[PDB]
Each structure stands twice: as C-alpha cells, then as structure tokens.
Design an enzyme around this catalytic site. Structure first.
Site, mmCIF file in Angstrom:
data_model
loop_
_atom_site.group_PDB
_atom_site.id
_atom_site.type_symbol
_atom_site.label_atom_id
_atom_site.label_comp_id
_atom_site.label_asym_id
_atom_site.label_seq_id
_atom_site.Cartn_x
_atom_site.Cartn_y
_atom_site.Cartn_z
ATOM 1 N N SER C 96 0.798 -1.240 0.000
ATOM 2 C CA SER C 96 0.000 0.000 0.000
ATOM 3 C C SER C 96 0.811 1.260 0.000
ATOM 4 O O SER C 96 1.797 1.465 -0.724
ATOM 5 C CB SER C 96 -0.768 -0.105 1.374
ATOM 6 O OG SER C 96 -1.980 0.569 1.251
ATOM 7 N N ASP C 226 -9.452 -5.080 -5.066
ATOM 8 C CA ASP C 226 -8.856 -4.201 -4.062
ATOM 9 C C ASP C 226 -9.779 -2.992 -3.931
ATOM 10 O O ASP C 226 -9.937 -2.260 -4.926
ATOM 11 C CB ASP C 226 -7.435 -3.817 -4.481
ATOM 12 C CG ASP C 226 -6.698 -3.062 -3.386
ATOM 13 O OD1 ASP C 226 -7.403 -2.309 -2.693
ATOM 14 O OD2 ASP C 226 -5.489 -3.227 -3.195
ATOM 15 N N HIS C 255 -7.377 -5.828 -0.732
ATOM 16 C CA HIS C 255 -6.216 -5.000 -0.432
ATOM 17 C C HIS C 255 -5.334 -5.652 0.628
ATOM 18 O O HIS C 255 -4.093 -5.542 0.566
ATOM 19 C CB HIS C 255 -6.731 -3.652 0.095
ATOM 20 C CG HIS C 255 -5.619 -2.671 0.285
ATOM 21 N ND1 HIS C 255 -4.872 -2.191 -0.748
ATOM 22 C CD2 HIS C 255 -5.194 -2.058 1.422
ATOM 23 C CE1 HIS C 255 -3.985 -1.333 -0.262
ATOM 24 N NE2 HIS C 255 -4.162 -1.223 1.038
#
Lengths: 275, 275, 275
Positions: C96, C226, C255
């Site tokens: 991320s 995601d 995610h």
C-alpha cells in the site's frame, strides 16, 4: 525500569511497594507479559510486600531480539535483573512457562538470592512425550500451535484464551470477555519470533536436573482440569523430584486459574510466603 | 518526547503544531492517556494552535513508578513539562481527574506560564462525602471501584465505558463500540497500582483552596447527566469559588461528552480560547 | 532497535535472522505498523533470510513528531535506517502506502543498497483523479476519510478493516475477527496527526518519476478486487513505467491479501526473491 542483559537486550520490569519490603518476584507464562499479574501484585502490595515482575525478552515492553529464545537465556535474564536490583531472600512465583524459568534460575542462583519458589500450573519436569516420559504430549500438539501462530497470530490469540486457557469452553463456566481481550493484547504486543520459538523451549526442555538441585521450599500448585499443561504429567512429578515441596491440587480449575479463581489461590500463596 | 521528573520518572508527551503557536495543553482523565484527546488535538491544530498532551505517571506510555500517585505530584510533573518546554501564556484544558490536576497546577504555576484554564466534567471542589461536603458521594461508591479494579481490572475496564462513562446505558443513546474499546485499551496500558491509588486522589482531595487561588479566567463545562462526577456537587460549586469563571451547562450530556458530542463542545472551547 | 533521524525522531525497527542472511526489508501500509508483517517475517526467517521491518514515524512504537508526514521524509527515514544497519543488496517489500515509500527510497538509494523491490497493492503511480490521471479516485473519497478519522478515529478504525480492507464485506468471505482487532490496535497505537496527514501523502503524491528511475527488478503484485487502492489505476500503470517489472494479478483478492491469503502470496514472493 529496564535492565540491559549481557547481549544488549533491554528487559522491562515493574517494581512496586516498600523498598525495604520482602521481594516477591513474578514470572509470567507464554505468550504474555508482566501485566498478567495485576491481581496478585495488588494483593501482595496490600499485604506489605515489594512486588517485582518483568517482561520476558520478546514479550510485552521488552526488546524483540533475534536470539536468546530459550530457557538458559531466560534464566540468565532473571539473574541480570536480581543482580541489578540486589535482591536478597526473594520469593519467586512462576506461572506455566514462567515456572520453568523459575526452576532453572533458582537451581543456578547465587546463595541468599532466593528464599522460596512457587510453581503454578508449571511445565516441569518435561512436557513432550518421549522414552523417559511416556505420559507426555506428542510433538504434533506443539507443531499445531507453531503452525497456527505463524499463519494468523492475531486469530490464534483469540482462540487460545477463548477455549482451553481459562476453561471457558467448559459448560456452565463463568466467562469474562475482559480476560480474553487482555490475554490477546498482551500476546499481540510481544514478538512473533520469540513466541514461536518459545513453544519448543517450554515443551521440550527437560527440567528434571534443575528440580533435583533446588533446596529451598517450593509450593507446587496446579489445577486438575488444566487443558494446556496436563496436570498428571507435571505437578505430582515435580513434587516428587523436589526435596522440600508442598503439592496443592485444585479440583476442576484451569490453566489460567490465577485470573479466573484468585480468591481460591491468593490466600494459599500468602500462607506459603508467610510460612 | 519525554521529560524526566525530579524523582526520575519519565513522562511521555505529544507536542504537535507550530512551534510559535499559542500552546493549548490537554490533561486526560482517569484511567486514560493523552490519546483520549485525538479529536480535540486535531480540531485545535486545524485552527493553528500548538497542542500538547502528556500521559500521567503510571498511565499510557509514561513510567509506572511505585509512588507519587497523588495530586501534588501530578501537578509537579506538569510543572516539570511546562518548564522543559518553557511554555508561556498557555491554555490548560482538563477533563475529569485531569480537571483536578489542572486546578492544582494553575494555582501554583509560575506567573506568566498560564493564560486561561478549562475544567470539563471535572472533580473539584471535592467528591467524597465528609464533614465539609454532605451532598458528596459516600466512600463506599469508591471502595467498590477499588475492589472491582483489584479483582479483574480487564473486565472492570469494559464495564465502565459500556455503562456510565459515555451514557451508553441511556435509552436512545448512540453507542460507539470504538469509544468503548479505545477506553479499555488506554486503561489496560497503564499501571494497576497507579489506577488503584488514583481513585483516592481524585475523589478525596479537596481542591477548594486551589480554586480560591486561581486568578486567570476559567471556563467550567459539565454535562447535566454526568454519571461519574455528579453535576450539582461539582460545576456550579467550582464556578462560585473561582474569581473569574464562566459556567457552561450541557443538558443531558454524559461524563465523556468530549468524545460523544465533540461537535457541540469544540466550538465552545474554541470561543473561550479566542476570547 | 531504534534509530534517531536527523530531526530527532526515533524510529522503532525489528531485525531478526542470520547476520549474513540476505536482508528482506518490509514497509507496512497505512495506518499500521511493523507488526502487520508477522506472517511474512516468520515465513522468510524459516527460509534463512534476515528480515527487517520498521514502524513509520507517527506509527506503532515510533515517536509521534509534529512534522515530516510526507513521502520525501519517509524515504529519508528509511535511508537513515539502512545506513545505520549498513544494508547491502537488500530486497525492499512495500504494501500500500509502504509501496510508495519503497518506490521513493529505491529511486534515490546509494549504490549497492538495493537488489530488488516488490510493490504489493501499492499506491503508485498516483491515486487521485486529475487531468493527468482521469481514472483516479476523486478528492472527495479522501476528504471523507479525513473527516471520519478526525471525528472518531477509534470507530473509523473498526469500520475500515470490517468493510473494505480485507474484503470481509463480500458475500461468502471467511471473516477473521483477529485480523480486524489487530488492524485496529496497530492503528490506535499510531498518531492521529500522522495518520490524518498521511492520507494526502499516499493519495496525492505522484510517483511517476520515481518509477522511471528504478532499474532493479521489481515485482508488482495486486488483487483485482482491491477496494482501497483500485487495481486498474495502479498495478498495470506501475508495470508499464518500470524498466524491469513483472506484473502478477490475483483475481478477486482484497487489499489486505498478504494477511487473508498468505498461502497464495508467500510462494510468489519467495520465487521472486530466489530469481
């Protein structure tokens, strides 16, 4: 406070009560921290004792080192602490894994460091099933724990306290959600590598020789419905190996009976410390 | 950062915002930490203030010493921090037990260090029933908190925020599980002996004399459905003893109203800091 | 361990495994901590690697400074750490927001410091919608995050992991309550101001030029469902801009896939590091 050991690891500890009080030293189990002793520390503080509890390396607020996850290092870390504080005539109380740490440290302690020891729901003599210990648990039980911890530690640490650790899986048992949440929080603060490696250190280390060298009085306390450290392969055997042991058996109590049943255990601990 | 007090205790604190902004310092209640101010810290930051908040000794990330769990030491630890940062013209906002710490620090502070003070849901003048305070709460109310805390702190710290602290036991309230769980976490981070001893410090200390000594402007805010620090024995009495006080009453709000109704309270705190 | 940066911010980090093991360095996402990598750290340690992971400033156990919540500073804090450990030929893995920090660090790293990089569910090249990035997410999405975080962080940190982060809002998903509670804990330990300011840092930073300067092999891994960092505006675009990239799409994964499907991702990370 913190104590730095010989390899540079910082160990966190609490030290409450009268500086002149008789020192009562608490050794937490796996995979917890000195905060698992809140109830007993307040209890002993109220009776005038000095109460000391540390976070094992890789646990709680202590450092998370790459190595030293074994009973000899644990016992050496205790000796660093008791030497730094210059403790004399202390009473050491260890729970579960902490009872193995106590057995190894008391066997090796300098003279006059220890007056008495208490092994509660403790791992000695030895947990794993073998030639020498036909009644032990098979290695596969500990492989299971290793695999679940490595795969999803956060869920595994809800399952353990929710099921076997406090006996909340028993029909009719009084359940406390705060004890479940607090066990999980203590475990999540500690290190995944120390917790994973400590499984082999508490279940495969033979403490028979340690117990044979202990000469101070030892209270051996254990619950008979302990789903984590089977009663019959621990308490009675340890008592038989110690020279001056008092064995107390609590019918129907679980592995974390210090937190589920403190009104049963605390008076028995204080009596022994005062004897 | 941290500041070391006279007895060697390390106090954790946060210091965010412009280095030259007017400093607004937040004093958390029992048994929490500086993290209870998240909302107000971001709100004040957005209006260009420098925002400071410490963990009281034995709370949050501060050390957990054996002694000094009393208002005089709490106010001296505040002086140690404001001297290390050299604050001048600061506004001090205290909630609950932190409102008692604010009253004692402000009464003794070096002149020029404090400009204004805010007591929200605060303990002054005195909570417990005594010869000088017949409308107070009986000691037995506090003896129950002590006994529940000592018996199972982890469960007692679910019970308080689930029930009386935030008024979630009132019909029609908006319940936030987040507020419950955050209260619990902040509580379980701190030390059991500090939290235990603090109950006598917040409920039996008489702040009457401190309040008569304060000369800066003081905003006294309090919810009328406060189930922890009863409204009628606190807020209107504090305001009558203070030389320059402004009394703000919030119909039906709870003890933890800064977290359940920040949109109502924040603008009123802001107006006071700008006045 | 801790390293102090050039603005005096302390950064906590873990460093486990053989000292002569190839260093695999993990960069967690928003708003988490080094502890988000427990599974992958134990996995790589079991294959003989040295594993390293730090808490980003304002997160986890690291200090909570007033400033420095931006990608240039996050990459200079990583440089400070890899210089202190003297890492050579490391593999950098970023999740991320951590994948943007890896891109910035690797693009500027000194000669010999980096061998390879892995961008998992990462923010590059740029998330926010614009004339240059017509498929981005509108600024309004991130304004809602800012607003929810500032109003009640504790509740917003339950909602995120409960809904979008791990795909637990999808019919038929297997929910892990431990994953939810651990996300929340790691989030609440970090600073409200850093978490708030980091939203602009991860969503508005354009990493296009960073990607064009990286010449080591880069694995770009991303789940197609995601809900936090949309696949189409990230992984394929990052893979086109990198000189030597391998793109791996995981159909229907969320995610938080490193934690929900480690049996799928860990083999692929290992094969990339052995290649």
């Amino acid at each position: 406070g913190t104590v730095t050991t010989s390899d540079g690891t910082n160990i966190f500890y609490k030290d409450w009560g009268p500086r002149d009080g008789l020192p009562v030293v608490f050794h937490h189990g796996w995979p917890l921290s000195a905060d698992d002793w809140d109830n007993q520390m307040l209890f002993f503080l109220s009776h005038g004792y000095r109460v000391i509890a540390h976070d094992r390396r890789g646990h709680g607020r202590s450092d998370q080192p790459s190595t030293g996850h074994d009973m000899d290092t644990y016992a050496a870390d205790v000796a660093a602490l008791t030497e730094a504080l210059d403790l004399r005539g202390a009473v050491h109380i260890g729970h579960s894994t902490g009872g193995g740490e106590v057995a190894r440290y008391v066997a090796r302690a300098e003279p006059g460091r220890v007056a008495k020891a208490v092994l509660v729901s403790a791992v000695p003599p030895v947990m794993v099933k073998s030639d020498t210990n036909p009644d032990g648990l098979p290695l596969e039980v500990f492989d299971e724990f290793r695999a679940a911890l490595a795969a999803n530690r956060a869920q595994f640490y809800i399952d353990v306290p929710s099921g076997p650790f406090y006996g909340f899986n028993r029909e009719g048992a009084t359940v406390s959600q705060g004890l479940i949440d607090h066990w999980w929080l203590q475990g999540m603060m500690g290190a995944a590598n120390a917790h994973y490696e400590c499984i082999a250190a508490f279940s495969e280390t033979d403490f028979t020789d340690d117990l044979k060298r202990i000469d101070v009085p030892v209270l051996v306390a254990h619950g008979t419905d302990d789903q984590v450290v089977p009663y019959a392969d621990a308490a009675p055997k340890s008592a038989e190996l110690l020279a001056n042991a008092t064995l107390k058996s609590y019918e129907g109590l679980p592995h974390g009976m210090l937190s589920t049943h403190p009104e049963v255990l605390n008076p028995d601990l204080l009596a022994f410390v005062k004897s």
